[PDB]
Design a protein around this motif. Sequence first.
Motif, PDB file in Angstrom:
ATOM      1  N   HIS A   1       0.846  -1.198   0.000  1.00  0.00           N
ATOM      2  CA  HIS A   1       0.000   0.000   0.000  1.00  0.00           C
ATOM      3  C   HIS A   1       0.880   1.246   0.000  1.00  0.00           C
ATOM      4  O   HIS A   1       1.508   1.563   1.018  1.00  0.00           O
ATOM      5  CB  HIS A   1      -0.937   0.021   1.193  1.00  0.00           C
ATOM      6  N   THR A   2       0.905   1.946  -1.134  1.00  0.00           N
ATOM      7  CA  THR A   2       1.568   3.240  -1.266  1.00  0.00           C
ATOM      8  C   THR A   2       0.598   4.332  -0.834  1.00  0.00           C
ATOM      9  O   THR A   2      -0.516   4.413  -1.351  1.00  0.00           O
ATOM     10  CB  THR A   2       2.025   3.469  -2.711  1.00  0.00           C
ATOM     11  N   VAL A   3       1.022   5.183   0.100  1.00  0.00           N
ATOM     12  CA  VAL A   3       0.191   6.264   0.616  1.00  0.00           C
ATOM     13  C   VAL A   3       1.005   7.539   0.478  1.00  0.00           C
ATOM     14  O   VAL A   3       2.094   7.661   1.055  1.00  0.00           O
ATOM     15  CB  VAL A   3      -0.274   6.059   2.068  1.00  0.00           C
ATOM     16  N   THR A   4       0.482   8.491  -0.294  1.00  0.00           N
ATOM     17  CA  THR A   4       1.262   9.652  -0.712  1.00  0.00           C
ATOM     18  C   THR A   4       0.916  10.917   0.066  1.00  0.00           C
ATOM     19  O   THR A   4       1.380  12.006  -0.302  1.00  0.00           O
ATOM     20  CB  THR A   4       1.095   9.894  -2.214  1.00  0.00           C
ATOM     21  N   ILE A   5       0.202  10.795   1.180  1.00  0.00           N
ATOM     22  CA  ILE A   5      -0.170  11.921   2.005  1.00  0.00           C
ATOM     23  C   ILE A   5       0.088  11.592   3.478  1.00  0.00           C
ATOM     24  O   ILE A   5       0.314  10.439   3.859  1.00  0.00           O
ATOM     25  CB  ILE A   5      -1.626  12.341   1.792  1.00  0.00           C
ATOM     26  N   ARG A   6       0.042  12.642   4.291  1.00  0.00           N
ATOM     27  CA  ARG A   6       0.263  12.562   5.735  1.00  0.00           C
ATOM     28  C   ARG A   6      -0.985  12.054   6.427  1.00  0.00           C
ATOM     29  O   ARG A   6      -1.967  12.785   6.599  1.00  0.00           O
ATOM     30  CB  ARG A   6       0.671  13.929   6.270  1.00  0.00           C
ATOM     31  N   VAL A   7      -0.974  10.758   6.782  1.00  0.00           N
ATOM     32  CA  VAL A   7      -2.142  10.179   7.428  1.00  0.00           C
ATOM     33  C   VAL A   7      -2.382  10.840   8.770  1.00  0.00           C
ATOM     34  O   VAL A   7      -3.533  11.046   9.179  1.00  0.00           O
ATOM     35  CB  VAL A   7      -1.987   8.653   7.587  1.00  0.00           C
ATOM     36  N   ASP A   8      -1.301  11.163   9.490  1.00  0.00           N
ATOM     37  CA  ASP A   8      -1.449  11.782  10.805  1.00  0.00           C
ATOM     38  C   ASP A   8      -2.117  13.145  10.739  1.00  0.00           C
ATOM     39  O   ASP A   8      -2.639  13.615  11.759  1.00  0.00           O
ATOM     40  CB  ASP A   8      -0.079  11.902  11.493  1.00  0.00           C
ATOM     41  N   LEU A   9      -2.109  13.793   9.570  1.00  0.00           N
ATOM     42  CA  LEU A   9      -2.733  15.093   9.379  1.00  0.00           C
ATOM     43  C   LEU A   9      -4.023  15.024   8.567  1.00  0.00           C
ATOM     44  O   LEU A   9      -4.617  16.063   8.257  1.00  0.00           O
ATOM     45  CB  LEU A   9      -1.735  16.055   8.704  1.00  0.00           C
ATOM     46  N   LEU A  10      -4.490  13.834   8.224  1.00  0.00           N
ATOM     47  CA  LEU A  10      -5.681  13.762   7.395  1.00  0.00           C
ATOM     48  C   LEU A  10      -6.892  14.170   8.215  1.00  0.00           C
ATOM     49  O   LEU A  10      -7.152  13.586   9.265  1.00  0.00           O
ATOM     50  CB  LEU A  10      -5.842  12.354   6.844  1.00  0.00           C
ATOM     51  N   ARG A  11      -7.623  15.167   7.738  1.00  0.00           N
ATOM     52  CA  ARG A  11      -8.740  15.750   8.467  1.00  0.00           C
ATOM     53  C   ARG A  11      -9.837  16.142   7.487  1.00  0.00           C
ATOM     54  O   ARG A  11      -9.573  16.716   6.427  1.00  0.00           O
ATOM     55  CB  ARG A  11      -8.294  16.992   9.316  1.00  0.00           C
ATOM     56  N   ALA A  12     -11.080  15.826   7.844  1.00  0.00           N
ATOM     57  CA  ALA A  12     -12.220  16.154   7.000  1.00  0.00           C
ATOM     58  C   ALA A  12     -12.237  17.637   6.642  1.00  0.00           C
ATOM     59  O   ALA A  12     -12.116  18.501   7.515  1.00  0.00           O
ATOM     60  CB  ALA A  12     -13.518  15.778   7.714  1.00  0.00           C
ATOM     61  N   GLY A  13     -12.413  17.924   5.349  1.00  0.00           N
ATOM     62  CA  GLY A  13     -12.509  19.280   4.859  1.00  0.00           C
ATOM     63  C   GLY A  13     -11.195  20.024   4.753  1.00  0.00           C
ATOM     64  O   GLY A  13     -11.204  21.222   4.424  1.00  0.00           O
ATOM     65  N   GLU A  14     -10.075  19.364   5.016  1.00  0.00           N
ATOM     66  CA  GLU A  14      -8.742  19.939   4.900  1.00  0.00           C
ATOM     67  C   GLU A  14      -8.019  19.326   3.713  1.00  0.00           C
ATOM     68  O   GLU A  14      -8.054  18.108   3.507  1.00  0.00           O
ATOM     69  CB  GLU A  14      -7.889  19.707   6.151  1.00  0.00           C
TER      70      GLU A  14
END
Length: 499
Positions: free
Chosen positions: A31-44
Amino acid sequence: DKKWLGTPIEEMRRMPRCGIRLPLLRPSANHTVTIRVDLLRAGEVPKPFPTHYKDLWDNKHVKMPCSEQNLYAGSRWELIQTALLNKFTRPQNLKDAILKYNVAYSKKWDFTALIDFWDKVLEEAEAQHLYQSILPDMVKIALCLPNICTQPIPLLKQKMNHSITMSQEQIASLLANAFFCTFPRRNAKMKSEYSSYPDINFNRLFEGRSSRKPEKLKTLFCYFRRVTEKKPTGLVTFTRQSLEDFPEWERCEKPLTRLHVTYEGTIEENGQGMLQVDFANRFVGGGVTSAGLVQEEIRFLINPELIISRLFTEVLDHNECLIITGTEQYSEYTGYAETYRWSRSHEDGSERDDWQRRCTEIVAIDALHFRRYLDQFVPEKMRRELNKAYCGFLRPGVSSENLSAVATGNWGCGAFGGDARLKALIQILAAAAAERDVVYFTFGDSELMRDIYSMHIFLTERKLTVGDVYKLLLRYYNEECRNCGPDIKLYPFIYHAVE
Ligand SMILES: Cn1c(=O)c2[nH]c(SCCN3CCOCC3)nc2n(C)c1=O
C-alpha cells in the motif's frame, strides 16, 4: 408493465452502511500512501508525504515530468515551464506551447479538435474565460507537481496485488500535466517501454473533427475549472487485484444470490454505494483520451480522477481487475457515442469514509471481444468471463454481510459482441460465488429485464447451485454450439433441460 423486477433495490446492501470500520490508513509493502495520514482531516487539503520531492526514474515507477532525469543535455521540465508560462490568447499559442517540449511529434499530432473547440464551439466570453482563467490555472497546478506529488508512484504492474492511495489534489496536478502532454516516454507509437500501458497524455483528444470532442472537452474543462478553483479535499485508492484461486465452477455448491433487475436507471446514479462495474477495456479507460465514448469512457469523463489510473496501470491480464474507491462525479451528461452531451456541473453528495474517500467503488473488468458470436459459448471463454467477473467482485478478507450489491448491466455487449443473456447469467454466477447480490440495469431493454428476472426466479425456485447452472451452460455449448447462430437460444435451452 413494471419498471423493475425481483428484490427491491432498497433491500440491497450499499456503502457506507454495510461496511466495517476501516483499519488505520498506513503505508506498507502492498500500500503506497502519498499523504500525511497523521494530518488527514475532513474538509482539509491533505498534506503530501514526504515534504520534499523524492524522485525515482526506473522501470517500476512513473517517470515524472519534473524528474531531473527527464532530459532532451537540457532539462525537459525547465523547457515545459518556459513553454507553458506564456500568455495564451489563441489556440495556436497552446498548440505551439505543447509542441515546444514534444518536437518529435510536431508533424504527427493534430490539434484540429482543440482549435475548433476554442474558435468554433465556444462563444467569445467562454473562450475568454478559458484562456484568461482556466488554462493559466491548469498550468499553475501542473507546474506545482514537484511540491504536490512528492513521493514516487509505483506502477501497478501485471501480477501485482498493490494499492495506491493519493489525494484528489495530487490527481488534479497529474491530470493537468496529462492535458499539457508532459509525461515522458508515453508517446511513441513503436515504444517498448510502456507499450503495455494505456495512453495518458491527452494529445489524441485534440485531433480530428468529431462532434464528440467538444463534448469530451466541455466535460474535462468542467472538472479542471472545479479543482483549480477550490482544491478537493479527499483521497482516492487504486487497487490492482490478481487472483489465482478460482472456483471449480462445475463443482460449486453455492446457491444463487438476490437479483434486482430494471430497464430504467444507470449504474452511477441508481447504484450509489454499490460495487459499480466499469465495462472496461483491458487498457483501462479505453479510448477516453482519444475517440471512444461508450460506458467506460463516459464514466472516466464524468469522474476524471479515474483517468489517472492510465498513468500507472498495466494492461489487465485475464485474472486481474482494477478497483478504484473515492472518485468524485463532476459532470452530468445525456446520451452516448454520437449523442453524448455534457449537461452541467455536478455537485457530488456522496458521503466520505474514514479515509476521506467518496463512498463510490468502481471495478474495471474487461470482457472479451468476440469476432464470432458462437465463440463466446466455448467453455474456456465462459470460464474466462466467470473468473474475470469473480476477480472483480471478490473481496478477500471481508464478510459477505459487509459486501455491497454489484451494480452492473450488459457487460461486453455492443462493440465486443457479447450475448446479453449469457453475460447476465455469467455475472449472476460470479456474484453468487463471491456471495454478493446483483443489481442489473438493462439500459432501456424491458424484454431483457423480464427474461433475466424469469430465468433467475426459475433457477432459484428449483434451488440450482452455481455448479448446476454452469453444467447447463456446458451442455448448451455441446448440444447447440460446438457442431453448429444456434438453432435454440440459451434460456429456452435451459428451461427445457431443467423441466
Ligand atoms: C447499465 N448501463 C449500460 O449498459 C450503459 N451503456 C452506456 S453507453 C454504451 C451502450 N451500452 C448499451 C447497453 O449495453 C451495453 C453498452 N452507458 C451505460 N450506463 C450508464 C449504464 O448504467
